[PDB]
Structure formats: C-alpha cells, structure tokens
Symmetry: C3
Subunit: 414 residues, 3 copies
Amino acid sequence: GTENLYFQSMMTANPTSIHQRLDRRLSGFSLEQPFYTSPEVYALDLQHIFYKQWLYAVPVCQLAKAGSYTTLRVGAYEVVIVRSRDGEVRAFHNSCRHRGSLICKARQGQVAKLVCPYHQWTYELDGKLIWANDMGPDFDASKYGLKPVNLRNLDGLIYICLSDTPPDFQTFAQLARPYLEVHDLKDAKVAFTSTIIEKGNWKLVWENNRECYHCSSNHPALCRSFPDPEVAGVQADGGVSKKLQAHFDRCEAAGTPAQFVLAGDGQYRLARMPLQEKALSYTMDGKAAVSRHLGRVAPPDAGTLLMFHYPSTWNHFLPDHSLTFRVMPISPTETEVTTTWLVHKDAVEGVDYDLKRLTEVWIATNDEDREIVETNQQGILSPAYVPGPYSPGQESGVMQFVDWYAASLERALA
Amino acid sequence: GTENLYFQSMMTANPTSIHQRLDRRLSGFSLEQPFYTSPEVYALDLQHIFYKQWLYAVPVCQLAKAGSYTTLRVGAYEVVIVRSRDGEVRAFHNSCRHRGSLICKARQGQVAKLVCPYHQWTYELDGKLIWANDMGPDFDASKYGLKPVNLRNLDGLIYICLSDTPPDFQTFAQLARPYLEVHDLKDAKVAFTSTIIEKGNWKLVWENNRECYHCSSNHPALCRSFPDPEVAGVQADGGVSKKLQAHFDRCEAAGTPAQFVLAGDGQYRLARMPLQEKALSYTMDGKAAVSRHLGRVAPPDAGTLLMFHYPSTWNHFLPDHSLTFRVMPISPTETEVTTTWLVHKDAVEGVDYDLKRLTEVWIATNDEDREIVETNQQGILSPAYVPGPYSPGQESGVMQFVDWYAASLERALA
Amino acid sequence: GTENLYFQSMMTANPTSIHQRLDRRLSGFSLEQPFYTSPEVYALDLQHIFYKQWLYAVPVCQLAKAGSYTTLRVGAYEVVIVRSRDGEVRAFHNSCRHRGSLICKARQGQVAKLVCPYHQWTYELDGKLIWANDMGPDFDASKYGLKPVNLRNLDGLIYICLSDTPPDFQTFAQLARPYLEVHDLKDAKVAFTSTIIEKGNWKLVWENNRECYHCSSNHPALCRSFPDPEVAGVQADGGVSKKLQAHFDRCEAAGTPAQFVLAGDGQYRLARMPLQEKALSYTMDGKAAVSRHLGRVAPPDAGTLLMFHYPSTWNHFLPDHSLTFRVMPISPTETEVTTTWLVHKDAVEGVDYDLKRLTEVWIATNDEDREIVETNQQGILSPAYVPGPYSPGQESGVMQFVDWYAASLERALA
Ligand SMILES: CN1CCC[C@H]1C(=O)O
Ligand SMILES: CN1CCC[C@H]1C(=O)O
Ligand SMILES: CN1CCC[C@H]1C(=O)O
Ligand code: FES
Ligand code: FES
Ligand code: FES
Ligand SMILES: [Fe+3]
Ligand SMILES: [Fe+3]
Ligand SMILES: [Fe+3]
C-alpha cells in the first residue's frame, strides 16, 4: 500500500532544496511533492514546528485525581503529565535520569511517586529525585530531577511545548477564555476516546479539515447537522454575512461569546457557528446527545464553537458536549488523530446519553476523512503529481493553513 | 527474513561508485553486490530503466468495453488505462490535477467519466477536464487535464512509457507483428491472473528467467513440456541447429512465423520453439489446455512463441492459449510478477477448459522460481558474495540480459 | 512501538560526529543517544566490532555427526559450520561461488556434500568445488571453493571470526581451558534452545546483563538461586572478599578452577561464584536440574562458572548442566539472544531431567530482561535523553563493558 509507495517515490525524488521550494511557493497552490512525502521535510516539520509550538495534549479532567498521570508521545518524545501533591498539573520527560528508561509505561494511572521500573530511582510528583540506590556519597540528586516540559492550562485543556524557549501562549489564552469558560471543561469527564492512524502526511490531514469542499459527497452523517464555505473557512475575516452575524448576536445577547476571531499570525481561530437546519448537536437525529449539558451555553441552538490552533488541534464545543481533536505526526505519510468526547462529569452513560448515539457521527466522519486523506496521499506519491490550484470560494481555509505552515517554517529556518 | 538481511547488508556496504563499478564489469560474471541489493542502484534502475523504456501493462481485451478502465502502479507512478468514447485506448496519470488524489481506486471497472472522489472534478475519457466546482471565473480548465502517458498497442497487448521522450517502439512493433498477429489476441479474454511478489531484485528474476540451467532440478512440472540451452537462450543468434531449423520450417511452411530474431541492441527476441517430446501445451498431460484455440497457429505442434522485451516482460504464445508475464520493481529486494492466461473470448470455463488444468503448471513453476530467486537473493546479501562466472553453454541468455541492462544504464548516465 | 519511535528519533538527531562523541565520553556515564539509536553507529558496530572479533556460534555437540552442519546469520553474513570427512569442524560462507545462492537453507542437518540448490555446484565438506555443470574446458574450480571462515574450538564451544585478520584467540583459550575442561562439553547434548528478539540495541542488552542493580525488583525466580555486587561485576579485580575467596578455595581444593580472572583488555572474565543460600542450580527449588551431571565439577555446591567474552557471549556452567548465551545484532534497536541448555549426552528427558524444571528459571529471566531492555530503549529514544551516572557500587561491570566497547571502537577507527 502506502508504505511501499512512500519508499518507491523517494527513490527518484529530486533534492529537497527547501529554501528554493519555499521561495517559489505561491499561496494559491497545493504544495510540491516533498512537503507531503519526503523524510527531509518531515524532519524539519518535527524540529521546527512540532517541537517548537504549543500543542494540545489532553483534557485536564483526565488528571482529576491525586497522583494521577497520563502519557503521550510527541514525535520521539515521551511525555508524562501528572497532578502533583500541591494540586498543580505539571509535565515531564518520561525518561529516567539514570540510564534513560521510561518511568510510566501505562497510558494513564495513579501513583504516589514516580518510580523507575529499572532500578527504582524515585521521584516526587514535581520531578525531584528523592531516592537513588547506592550512588555513592558525592552523588548530587539535585542535578538529576526529571526534565520539565512547559505546560499551560487552557480553561480545562492541557497544552504543552517541547521547547526551552516557548512562544507566547498568553495572547491565545486571553482571547480564547471567554469562549471556552462557558463550557465548564474543568467539570467534564471523558466519555469516549478514539485514536486512529491516517496514512497521509499531517499537512494533508489539516488541508482536509480546513475545507468542506469534500463534505457533500463524502460525509452523509455529518451533513445532517454541519452546514456553507463561510462556516468552515476564513472569509468572515474580511467581513461577516448578515445571516451569520445574526447568529453571533443571538449567542452574545444570551451571554455566550461567538464572534469570529482570527489570530494576527493565523495560528488560531474561534467562531460559534450555526448548525444545519434545526440541528442542535452532532447526532443522527440532530437532537442533543446528552441531557445534562457540559457548561452554560445559551441559547440551545448556539451551535458549534469551532476552535483550531495549529499544528495540533481542532475542536467543536457544543451546548451539550464537546469534542477535541489532537493531530500528531507519525511518519512522512502517517498521522495520528485522537478524538475525545467530553461530557458533564455527572452525566451517566445509559441514562443521560447513549454511547453509540453520542459518538457515531464523528466516528463515521473521521473514517471518511481518513479514506479521503489516504487516497489523496497515494496520488501525491506519484512523480507526476504537481501543485494544483485551490478553490478561492471553497478552500480559503486550506490556503490559510498552508500559509501559516510555510511562514512558520520560513521563520524557523532563517 | 530478507527485509532485515537487506538492512544489515547495506549498513556495511562500500560506496556504490556506480561509474567505477560499471567500468570494471566483465560480461562473463554476475554483478557486484550493490546492483542487486543497494537502494542507490535501485533508484537508478527506476529513474533510468523503468521510467524511460516501453513497458508491458495489460492485454487490450481487459479494455473491451465502453468506459472500461484498468489501473497499475509502476514504481511510484499510478497509471490508469481507459477505453475512450472514440474507441481509442489511452493512458493517464491517475492523479487529480486539483490536489493530486487518485481518481480510480479499483483495479478495473467501467465509468462514464473519470470523477475524482475528493471534490468531484470531472474528466472526459480523453483526459480533458470538463467540470471543476467553484474555481472562479478565471480558472482555465485547459491547463488542468489529466497528464497523458505514452501508449502503444502491440497486436492486442498494451505497452506504456513514462517518459516524455520515449524510445523507438516501431522497430519492435514491426518485427513482432507477423509472429503475434496469428494469435488473434484482440479476440482473447483473460481466463486467470496470478500476481506474486518474489523477494529478489528484478534483475535476479530476469537472470533466473533467462536460463534453464536450473530447470531439471527445480521444475518437475514444466520439464514435462518445456525442453536444451538453444531454446531458452540466444546461441541461435550466431546460427541455428538443423533440428531447430526444421521446426521453424514446419511452422513457416504452414504460414506461422517462427524464425529466431534478436534485436540489434538485445532488447527483445522472438522465436517459436518446439516443446518436449510430444507435448502440445503447458499441461500435466501435455495436451492442449483449451479446445477452442486462441488464434490460427498451425501446425498443432508449432510449440511456444517465446517473446521477451526488457525490462518488463516475457511471454509464451501457444497454439491453444497464451501467457504473458509482467515484471515490476517493488524494492531493491522485491519484484512483482503478474502472469496472465489468455484464451479465446468464446472459450467457456468448465466446457472448453478446466481452470486447474490450464494454470497448474505455471502456478507451480512460478512458485519454484520464486523460491530459487529468494534463496539466491539471501546469499547475495552476504558481504562475502563476489561475482561468479556464468556458464557459457547454459547461461548465454543471462549474459545477454546483464549486458543489455549495463549498456542501458551506461547510456542513461552518460 | 519501538520501530516507529526509532524512525521518529533519527529524524531530528544531531550528526553522529563519532570522533567528537568518543573524545568527550566519560567512563562514569551511559552513552550518548546515537550509540544506542543511530544507524550510523550501528553500521560501525557491525563493521568494527562484530565483523572483527571472535564470536561464539554454537556448541560443538551440535556437529557430533558425520556430515552434520548448522547455519547462522551474523549481521548480513550467512555462515555454515560443518563436520568434514576428516572429523575436523570447519566454517564457510554459505554463498555459492557461481551466482551467490545460499547452499544450506535449513538451520541444521546432515549431508554427504554441500550441493547448491540452484544449479547443483557441488562442494566437498572442506569447501573444495568438486563438480560444476557445463562450465567450459578452461574453468578453474580451484578458484571457486567456498570462502572459509576462521574457526576455533573452545573446549566444546565453537567460535568464529569474520575477519581475514583475526585477533589473538589463544590467550583467552589458554586461560579458559582449565575452567571449561571440567565440564566435559564435548560430551554434551543440547537439551533445549531458546531464541528471542529484544527490542533494544545490543549494548543495552550487555549493560543490562552486566549488573544486578535491577535484579531484586525484576527477577523473582532467578533471585532464589543467583546472589551481591561482587558476584555479577568486576570489583574482585582490585581484590577479593574473604567470603568469596573461601568459596574459590573450596572449589580449587577439590580440583575445580574457580579464581576470578579478567583479561588485560577487559574482553573476557571467568569466575566460579557461589549461589544463594543453599541453592545448587538454577531451578525453582534450588536443587540440581539434572541427575546425571555434565562434567566432573566438585564440590556439588561449586556454584556457577560465569564466563563473558565480548561482544558475543555470556555463560553459566553449573555442576549439573550448562547454559550458553549468544548475543547477535539485528538492527540499531533489536538484538537476538540465543540461550542453549547443555546436559550430559546420556541424560534422558523425563528420567534424568524435566524440561520445564530445567528451563523455566532462565526462560522467565530472559523475558524479564527483555521487557526491561525494551523499556529502557524506549526512553532513550527520546531527544531529551542525556547520559546519566552509573552506580559505582552496583554498575562497575556496566562501566567495564562500555569502556571495552569504546576502546575497541576507538582502536578500529584510528
Ligand atoms: C469540514 N471540515 C471542517 C469541519 C469538518 C471537516 C470535515 O469535513 O469532516
Ligand atoms: C527456463 N526459463 C525460461 C523459460 C522458463 C524459465 C524457467 O526456468 O521457469
Ligand atoms: C545480573 N545479570 C548477570 C547475571 C544475570 C543478569 C540478570 O540480571 O538476569
Ligand atoms: S534507568 Fe531508572 S533507575 Fe536505572
Ligand atoms: S483532489 Fe480531485 S477534485 Fe480535489
Ligand atoms: S548459484 Fe549455486 S550452482 Fe548456481
Ligand atoms: Fe471531512
Ligand atoms: Fe525457472
Ligand atoms: Fe536481568
């Protein structure tokens, strides 16, 4: 399948010549092949994008309990996120300072201390090394605490940054707070998590996400509740339609922030968009999936709070529940997408919601997107693939993403 | 197995130094290791051989119907071959000009138009882009038709060439026509297709094919019907035995071209050779597999029309049925071989032929060749492998192939 | 799992700069990441370590019979070891001198001659080419015998060396003989063989082996019979404890060599160490596994003859049976470990020993070590991994190994 096509295609590819490629790039066109297929560009994307920008990791409700921890891989990093004894959430490199071992092997759990499974070096939940067996009298444990990972809490959503010099997160955090706080995400629980691998480059997953040019043919279930190019894109940035604005006004008159806002540098966007017709949620019948709402959004037909933050996440926060999506790179032609359904912590499965009803729409959607992304990746692997033009009407959000990515890479290579 | 051996062997391999290796090559010896094992030479073989020469794709009878199409991968290219509305067979790159997607996902089918599954850009069966949704009023669809692939019809067998500057095909086509036309291949149907992966370099598959030095020990079934070094090789090029010539004369007196002919540059060869003993076909009992013949070959014991055309194909055309073989590179140590059994279009399975009887000999043979090729590849992966001498008597066809390959590569690197 | 982590980690790794890394290395610290993760260092480890030093292959009792042979892969080499007609054991490259094929496909067997399966070139059991079909009258078979592999017999254990210029083996052989001869290994048979792949670099397998810092937490079964840092390491090299020396004296008064000895260059070590408490063998109850002993070791509580010889082997020779361990590199993050249980040739399964009782302890131990090695490898793959300090008390044997490896590599690159 794709693994072999990947190998075949890179055999005859011309040199990456990344500066030349970046120089000649036009914003109205899809990217030249090696951006989507080459290990050279993939290495750059890790080094300069995923290892430098803030990334969505997990909802904070996953760390509700004392000594609770969750682990994730970002590229080659293995990160552990923990609720320390002081109630603070902190992140560390999941690598013992002795000989490097993973410390936490499970995806989630609770501990009293972080105990290396190899020789039992023992760390407090704030990373300090509190016991190391037989290291001699001049061993200085202060030099051998776990390495910290920069971490922020975005109103109930934990973000991390693998750089020692992280970019400004406060601008985004301040902008987003009014929109997110009404969802009370700190009072959520995880109802369901779905993790899939899509056999396409992470950028193809994002280009796919940033348009609904493909949705009428490809997403029967989603199309019952998700609408219009102005919804899914960014042409509302140059000015809002009267019908859309009336929706924003209904939300905001009711005390729910809605207005479309786009970062200066294009990194992130928030907008609370209307749903189709009379739909209220992402369900097959269009009605709320959960009877006990997560948050205080009003009115009931407030629709979907769309939030993207490149490179890691897109999100849908509805009046009754929320969904977060985490995009993580696996190889030049593979990307991991993790979808997390968030419901009120006291919402009871089988009473306030049905698992199938809650998840079926986006399970189906994700599978459809995956098939499309994978088909797109396979064609791109041809040596005959050349950039093609994006639709100005239907793909302005795709251009906006690709521009963000190219600018980010350019700045990092300067 | 071989995948790991491949990785191990390339770790310590000396530099490819391809010009030096080509310089010191002697025609009487097998090739130095990296020709058979290195990704560097494999990349060259794709770029300079498979992407530059004409290649056998499929029988034209697979495209008998209106709107019919078949897809194939050549290296990293994905090609679609289609019967257009004017009755002409044409080939295209199976990559949408929008964002690159595969258009035809199935191996075979029928369509009215080529409709991209992603955003439904729609193409006529001659590649023209006839509808693109919402591209703006200055989109010029004339610039965005599917990219054509050079295609020839060799008397019922479709050949393609991935280069914008294809080599001369007419010399071969003219030579071959008299031999092939008597098989009426345009009136065939595909009775059976077998696709296997052999874990050896494509050149090892060809060296294996071009001798019967290995056949008495390794091919019990084939040896009941397939003969003698003069059959399988090229020593008839310097002059024909009296017994072989008498066979050619029996065929040709009956109006069936037979005489051994070898290209100037060694690319191709045709000869109608006698079968063993009293055999008439490649079956366990030696009798015709199919009672309704494909073509008008006479006499009934005309034997096998051998045709090879490097790098893609060898073929056996018998009085009752025909077999085509397509060799396609998968990685430095993997090669795809596709065997196609062709019978008269009106021959009925279970009445005029039995599927098992028709296919069992060459299914077995291919499996035996595969085991041999794979065993050979595994030994070659050793760093202790050094070229060895070919048998002048039994491997003159192997030398002839290796000479063609080296000359072709030399010319392409000049 | 690890395969993908390997790929991710090498994408962003800094250049290998092997001389600089070797220059700055401190003996008290674990190695910088690329020693354990990079294909560049793995290639060096093959070229300069595994392809240059003597390596443990198999016990000679596996070649007891006339025409008997055994095959093994070392890196990319395929080696065949054979008992020739003169009774001598010899090794060859398992690659036919014609076109390179493997000759012996099975792991073990008996033959009269070595017959290539491809075109039946036939070799005597001392490698001479005695028949080649149809090679012409000026073919000189004297030039086309199998390529020999340097081979030594270490008191019943066959060692090989892939270099044309092997290092001195006699120093080790002379030192080891008194300790090994009392085990009568030439009179052994193989009771059981276990081959596992551990997903860590070969060096991580060795560092793991060379300490029991991890054993109390990780090896419940082994800890019932295997003891103390002085046992498993090398601090007895600077001087022996009174309790350990008393053990050596009990052995040696009984005519069984025991005293700790360490090579000048650190390559190898032999010591006959006491077992825990009252244990006599590696069994769950601590009693002898086999009632008919392999060899003449006395007293019955002589304990374990530990022998390591880098890079290929560690070994435990007990009064009742013996175990050999062979370490072979598979990729930068994979290593093959082969454990061989040796018992007296006349010991009868189900009468003198029970297979489960004999093997269960070290089957369990190996599986525990494997899990630990693999967990360690996964943490090391993080870009945040940095060298950490070894315990002077508990890891002196780890330092000693890493010093041997670094010195060996330095000398080979000079
Ligand atoms: C349209 N894009 C943005 C939202 C949904 C996604 C998709 O088509 O599934
Ligand atoms: C002998 N070669 C050429 C024809 C058949 C092939 C083989 O041995 O199967
Ligand atoms: C302690 N090392 C050396 C001997 C045993 C090995 C282990 O812990 O299994
Ligand atoms: S690797 Fe963690 S204590 Fe040794
Ligand atoms: S990729 Fe084909 S229409 Fe968009
Ligand atoms: S490869 Fe061994 S005889 Fe030909
Ligand atoms: Fe979609
Ligand atoms: Fe064959
Ligand atoms: Fe252990």
